Amino acid sequence: MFENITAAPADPILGLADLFRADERPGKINLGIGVYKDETGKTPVLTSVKKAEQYLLENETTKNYLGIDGIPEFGRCTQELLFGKGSALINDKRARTAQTPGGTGALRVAADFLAKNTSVKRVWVSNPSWPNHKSVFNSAGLEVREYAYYDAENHTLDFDALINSLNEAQAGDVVLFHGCCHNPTGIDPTLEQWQTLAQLSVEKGWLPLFDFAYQGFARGLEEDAEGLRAFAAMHKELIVASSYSKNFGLYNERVGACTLVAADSETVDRAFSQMKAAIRANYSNPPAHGASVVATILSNDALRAIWEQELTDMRQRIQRMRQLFVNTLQEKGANRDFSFIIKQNGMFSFSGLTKEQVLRLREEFGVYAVASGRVNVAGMTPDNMAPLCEAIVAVL
Amino acid sequence: MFENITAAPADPILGLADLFRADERPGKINLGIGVYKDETGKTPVLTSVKKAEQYLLENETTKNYLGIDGIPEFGRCTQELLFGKGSALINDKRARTAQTPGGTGALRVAADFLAKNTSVKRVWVSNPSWPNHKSVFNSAGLEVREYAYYDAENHTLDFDALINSLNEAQAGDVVLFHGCCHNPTGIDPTLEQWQTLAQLSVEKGWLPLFDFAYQGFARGLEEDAEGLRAFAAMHKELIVASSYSKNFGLYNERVGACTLVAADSETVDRAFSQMKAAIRANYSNPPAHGASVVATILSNDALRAIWEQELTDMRQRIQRMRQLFVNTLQEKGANRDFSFIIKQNGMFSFSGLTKEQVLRLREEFGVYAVASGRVNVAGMTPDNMAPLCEAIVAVL
Ligand SMILES: Cc1ncc(COP(=O)(O)O)c(CN[C@@](C)(CCC(=O)O)C(=O)O)c1O
Numbered sequence: 144m145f146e147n148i149t150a151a152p153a154d155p156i157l158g159l160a161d162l163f164r165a166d167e168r169p170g171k172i173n174l175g176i177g178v179y180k181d182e183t184g185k186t187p188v189l190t191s192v193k194k195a196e197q198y199l200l201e202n203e204t205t206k207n208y209l210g211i212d213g214i215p216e217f218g219r220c221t222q223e224l225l226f227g228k229g230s231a232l233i234n235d236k237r238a239r240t241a242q243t244p245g246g247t248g249a250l251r252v253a254a255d256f257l258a259k260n261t262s263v264k265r266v267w268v269s270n271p272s273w274p275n276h277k278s279v280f281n282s283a284g285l286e287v288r289e290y291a292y293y294d295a296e297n298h299t300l301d302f303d304a305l306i307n308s309l310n311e312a313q314a315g316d317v318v319l320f321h322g323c324c325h326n327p328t329g330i331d332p333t334l335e336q337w338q339t340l341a342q343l344s345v346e347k348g349w350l351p352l353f354d355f356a357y358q359g360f361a362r363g364l365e366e367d368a369e370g371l372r373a374f375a376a377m378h379k380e381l382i383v384a385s386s387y388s389k390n391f392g393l394y395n396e397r398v399g400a401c402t403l404v405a406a407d408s409e410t411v412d413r414a415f416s417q418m419k420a421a422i423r424a425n426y427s428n429p430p431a432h433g434a435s436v437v438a439t440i441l442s443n444d445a446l447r448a449i450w451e452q453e454l455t456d457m458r459q460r461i462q463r464m465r466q467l468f469v470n471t472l473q474e475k476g477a478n479r480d481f482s483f484i485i486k487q488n489g490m491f492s493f494s495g496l497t498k499e500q501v502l503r504l505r506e507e508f509g510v511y512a513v514a515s516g517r518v519n520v521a522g523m524t525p526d527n528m529a530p531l532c533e534a535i536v537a538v539l
Numbered sequence: 540m541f542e543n544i545t546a547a548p549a550d551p552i553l554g555l556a557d558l559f560r561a562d563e564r565p566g567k568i569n570l571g572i573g574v575y576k577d578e579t580g581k582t583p584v585l586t587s588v589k590k591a592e593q594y595l596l597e598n599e600t601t602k603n604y605l606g607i608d609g610i611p612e613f614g615r616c617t618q619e620l621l622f623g624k625g626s627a628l629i630n631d632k633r634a635r636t637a638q639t640p641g642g643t644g645a646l647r648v649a650a651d652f653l654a655k656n657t658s659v660k661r662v663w664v665s666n667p668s669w670p671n672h673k674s675v676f677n678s679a680g681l682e683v684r685e686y687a688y689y690d691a692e693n694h695t696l697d698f699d700a701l702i703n704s705l706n707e708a709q710a711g712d713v714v715l716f717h718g719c720c721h722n723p724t725g726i727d728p729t730l731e732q733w734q735t736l737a738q739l740s741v742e743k744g745w746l747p748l749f750d751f752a753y754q755g756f757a758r759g760l761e762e763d764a765e766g767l768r769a770f771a772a773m774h775k776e777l778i779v780a781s782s783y784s785k786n787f788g789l790y791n792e793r794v795g796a797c798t799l800v801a802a803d804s805e806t807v808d809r810a811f812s813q814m815k816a817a818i819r820a821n822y823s824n825p826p827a828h829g830a831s832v833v834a835t836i837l838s839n840d841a842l843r844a845i846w847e848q849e850l851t852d853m854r855q856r857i858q859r860m861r862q863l864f865v866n867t868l869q870e871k872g873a874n875r876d877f878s879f880i881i882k883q884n885g886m887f888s889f890s891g892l893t894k895e896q897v898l899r900l901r902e903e904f905g906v907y908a909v910a911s912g913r914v915n916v917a918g919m920t921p922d923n924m925a926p927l928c929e930a931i932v933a934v935l
């Protein structure tokens with residue numbers, strides 16, 4: 144029976160990592176997967192995380208199953224981070240949160256939930272977007288449509304085309320938005336643009352679904368949540384899939400959350416019971432460790448202060464590398480203007496290189512980037528910057 | 540969009556956990572969820588596990604993403620446990636293993652893998668069986684069929700009814716088998732019966748799917764795999780979803796595995812690529828903490844020896860409670876023979892109690908059991924045995 148199965152292509156992102164770990168030539172540079180790296184080029188575990196883990200090792204007395212929706216405090220801390228400490232959504236108990244295995248897991252439970260319990264048939268995603276978005280929703284049998292987003296000429300948000308392309312999104316359709324640090328463009332809407340979309344969203348009857356995987360990597364925790372909060376004060380219902388993989392450096396512990404928001408407490412609890420049914424038929428209940436670490440840190444004022452400082456340092460090192468990248472490209476003789484890179488948010492910048500050049504950089508200079516031209520700026524260091532820019536210039 | 544969602548019914552297993560937690564009676568007894576308890580009534584963290592976690596805390600340098608299929612060593616160690624150190628499936632490289640979030644997760648990925656890449660239409664499940672089996676397969680869009688298994692009169696396995704029931708399973712159909720410690724009956728096939736089923740399976744043309752969540756709780760590690768090893772030596776293709784939740788006491792860390800077996804190395808790798816795709820669209824990659832603990836314990840002989848002794852103590856304490864249970868029931872006035880309980884394997888015992896009785900035990904005496912009459916013997920201790928048996932006799 145397994146003879147008739149046709150092989151699957153390699154993940155355009157996770158695959159690259161294997162092709163890199165395979166390359167034998169010295170000096171290789173990995174600018175693929177969106178994982179943070181410090182000045183020495185390593186992905187260390189945060190100090191606040193090592194501390195939390197020591198606390199858990201000493202105080203855990205059992206590994207007994209968590210409830211289907213995970214750790215209670217985890218859900219509470221998540222909601223404050225997203226909506227704000229005094230939020231009315233929280234005070235009116237209009238939101239329920241389930242701890243999930245990563246942001247991906249949050250996206251999948253939301254998709255399964257929507258497919259099995261609502262009349263949702265279509266999800267609208269930006270073009271371009273994280274490749275895995277279409278796969279997650281299709282996995283639940285949901286049709287995925289794309290809306291315009293990037294002005295590749297001015298390296299900015301094509302707001303006019305975005306509005307026009309979403310004209311066909313009907314009431315009941317789900318529209319996916321990146322909370323901040325759009326992947327892979329790094330271009331986010333301004334608060335004014337968010338407000339416009341929020342209004343348009345309510346009038347058209349869309350079900351907003353926010354993917355929040357980089358909160359704190361744009362400007363700050365609270366600032367990066369402004370777009371979501373503009374919608375939240377405007378809508379009756381919405382879904383938010385968030386991830387702690389990057390802002391806590393907990394990639395492999397799979398820590399995320401799927402937050403459901405309904406018109407009132409009675410409706411959300413009812414709907415949430417069906418979300419739990421969906422989780423139960425998938426992985427039963429969430430992994431404890433990653434989420435325990437996060438709940439511990441967010442709950443302890445002393446630990447939280449350290450974490451917030453570590454997040455700030457990562458954010459600043461990236462912005463620092465953004466400026467150094469543009470300066471070195473000039474220094475090394477680039478005639479093309481890359482100034483636009485300074486205006487992008489997060490780990491990824493859309494370089495504007497053609498799939499051809501991207502392959503030439505790899506098989507010829509040993510530099511790895513995603514075929515879309517997306518480069519992980521957080522992977523750049525003072526030590527590989529020069530060879531990197533020298534490679535790019537040579538392929539321009 | 541959420542106004543008309545109908546509330547979902549509570550899980551017949553995980554639901555009780557919340558009821559029990561809420562009950563105010565100081566003398567409540569929990570015999571519901573299949574979780575091990577020591578003589579003190581606690582669900583401790585194994586010593587082998589605690590030591591392994593100390594190693595990790597001390598030596599982990601990064602939390603960087605694992606890889607769709609997880610830790611390689613983990614995959615190698617579970618195949619040896621399942622097939623045997625010098626198995627032909629291993630040497631001939633016919634097997635691929637993906638690390639999954641618990642056995643439940645392993646079941647869902649296998650289900651998704653099958654529904655999206657093959658012609659499989661329905662899955663055959665024992666009657667009775669773990670309630671979640673139907674939910675997991677129906678969620679992936681697969682039709683579920685039940686085959687006879689338990690003789691409620693003689694409290695034994697009705698091999699005649701089992702074989703006659705399965706004669707209706709067409710080729711290409713999937714048939715689910717519990718590796719050992721059948722849930723909820725506790726009655727497993729003899730090697731001879733396994734021998735037959737294996738032969739009948741190849742001839743009938745079924746795709747065997749083994750659920751192995753209790754290896755080591757029946758007779759022993761190697762011994763409990765006999766049934767599986769019998770099918771392995773005969774079939775070209777098979778799937779095994781295993782769990783480390785119980786034999787390692789790592790319930791909430793979600794540690795499981797899904798092993799794919801094909802005719803040759805080329806076919807399995809081709810098929811496994813789609814399984815990785817199914818995973819990527821679900822939770823992307825697996826949680827590292829639990830799987831890491833298992834890998835290091837199974838890899839270190841000094842640690843391994845400790846773990847194996849701990850598993851033996853757990854298996855033996857359960858056996859001692861099983862005997863104590865039957866003896867105490869007669870002493871407290873049981874007007875019936877519960878000897879059949881001694882013949883059951885695993886953590887449970889199919890008591891024979893009706894739903895109305897189980898219902899009465901909870902509300903009238905605060906003794907919690909599953910509505911099917913399934914009782915967790917691993918939850919019985921020398922201290923709660925008396926009150927527990929008195930309650931049962933009273934509703935008899
Ligand atoms: C928009 C976006 N949404 C959801 C996720 C899911 O994150 P999770 O917590 O790992 O499940 C990621 C991770 N993006 C990478 C940084 C990680 C690798 C990947 O593709 O999953 C990236 O390279 O894009 C995203 O960029």
Ligand SMILES: Cc1ncc(COP(=O)(O)O)c(CN[C@@](C)(CCC(=O)O)C(=O)O)c1O
Nearest residue numbers: 427552572573641642643669722752782784
């Ligand atoms: C046959 C069987 N299969 C799969 C699983 C899944 O295990 P996982 O690794 O936790 O995903 C369980 C756990 N059964 C319980 C011991 C746990 C509660 C539950 O229903 O999941 C039980 O009480 O049956 C099983 O009994």
